Every structure is written in C-alpha cells, then in structure tokens.
C-alpha cells in the first residue's frame, strides 16, 4: 500500500531533478521493502545522476542480484565501470547486455569503446 505511494513519490521527485530528496525517499522505501528490484534500479540511476559512483555500483549488483534480467541495468553498470576506468567488468557487462538485447547499437558501440580503450 504505502510503499508504492512513496515509490511513485520517488519517481515524481526524480522527474524534478532534486536528486537527494529522491535518495531519501528511496532509502525510506527500501526500509519498508528491501526487496524491490525496481526501487533498487531507480536508486541506481539516482546515484549515477548525482555522480557518486561506488554506491551506485553496489546498488547495481544488488539490483542484478534480485533481478538479473535487466539489460538497461547492465548497460548503465557498464557506463559506470567506464567512468571508473574499470574496463574488464565493463566488457562482461556489455557482452551480457547485448546477449539480453542484441538490437541495441548503444551496447555494440560501448563494447567497441571498451576494446579500444583497453587496447591503449
């Protein structure tokens, strides 16, 4: 009941760009239900938008832990790994993402960047 109320509050907040308030809402929500894959992922984009990377990563493997079938989550994790300079795990993330969704020129391209950047 109330958990999805605060969840919708969280997305309507995220639409407004006030990231920290959405962070607070998502923490409060996961206090109710620590087992919402959608909430975990949405907190993931929130962390990514604000830019602090490590907790974004941790939320990402958490989200993949309770739900491994999100190609977009894989792609976002790969972008984060690129941002950190971690290239290998980015490679596996993009490979798995394109396995889940091949017709994403974004995923193919990002694999290409990883190959080129690891090359140098």
């Amino acid at each position: 009941n109330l958990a999805e109320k605060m969840y919708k509050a969280g997305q309507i907040e995220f639409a407004k760009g006030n990231y920290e308030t959405a962070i607070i809402a998502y923490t409060l929500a996961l206090l109710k239900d620590p087992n919402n894959a959608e909430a975990w992922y949405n907190l993931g984009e929130a962390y990514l938008a604000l830019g602090n990377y490590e907790e974004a990563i941790e939320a990402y493997q958490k989200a993949l832990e309770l739900d491994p079938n999100n190609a977009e989550a894989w792609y976002n994790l790969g972008e984060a790994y690129l941002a950190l300079g971690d290239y290998d795990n980015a490679i596996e993330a993009f490979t798995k993402a394109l396995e889940l969704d091949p017709n994403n020129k974004t995923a193919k391209a990002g694999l290409k960047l990883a190959k080129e950047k690891k090359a140098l």
Partner: protein
C-alpha cells in the same frame, strides 16, 4: 511560421575520434539531455605544450534549451575525456514555430 526565439543554445565541441563523438552524442540523446546532435570531420592544428601539432578531429554541435543547458554542460565537463572540456554556446535569434513546439515537446 518564423518566430523570435531565445531558449536555444548551440554547444560546440570537438573530440579526436569519431567513436567517442558518436558515443557522447548517443548517450546525450538516449537520456534526453540533447535531442539534436551533429558530427563533422575536421582537421585541428593547435599549439600543444609549446609546440604546433596537426591532427584530424571531429566537431560536435549541440542545440538544447537553456533550462537543460546546465545539466548537459555539467555532465559533459565531468564526463569529457579531456580534463579541459570544450564549452562554446551560440544562440539563434529566431526559428519556425513548428520547431518551437516540436523541440519543446522533444526536449
């Protein structure tokens, strides 16, 4: 019909390889940061570290609303591979009302 406009800026930027050019454009457009992106092959001759250098580069042109401008430029500068990101903005004085409505809808 043509109407005067003031919420459009043209972001100018260049990168070495067309790969990361299209990557930055793709990332901006997919998340709605920049709905209009263009790429061109260009040759850059610069004075680097006290020496002149010749190189072929790829120029990026970004048009977006002034409200989304700050977020896009911040995302660029933190994400721009060079620690000294390119930031040049040009504002067109007018455009068709059709683009006004469309870009407002698409941005």
């Amino acid at each position: 019909s043509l109407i005067e406009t003031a919420d459009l800026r043209l972001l100018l930027t260049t990168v070495p390889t067309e790969t990361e050019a299209l990557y930055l454009a793709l990332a901006a457009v997919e998340k709605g940061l920049a709905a209009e992106v263009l790429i061109t092959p260009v040759t850059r001759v610069r004075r680097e570290n006290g020496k002149l250098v010749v190189e072929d580069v790829y120029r990026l042109s970004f048009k977006t609303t002034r409200e989304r401008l700050d977020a896009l430029v911040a995302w660029l500068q933190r994400r721009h591979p060079l620690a000294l990101p390119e930031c040049l903005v040009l504002t067109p004085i007018a455009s068709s009302v059709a683009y006004r409505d469309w870009l407002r809808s698409s941005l």
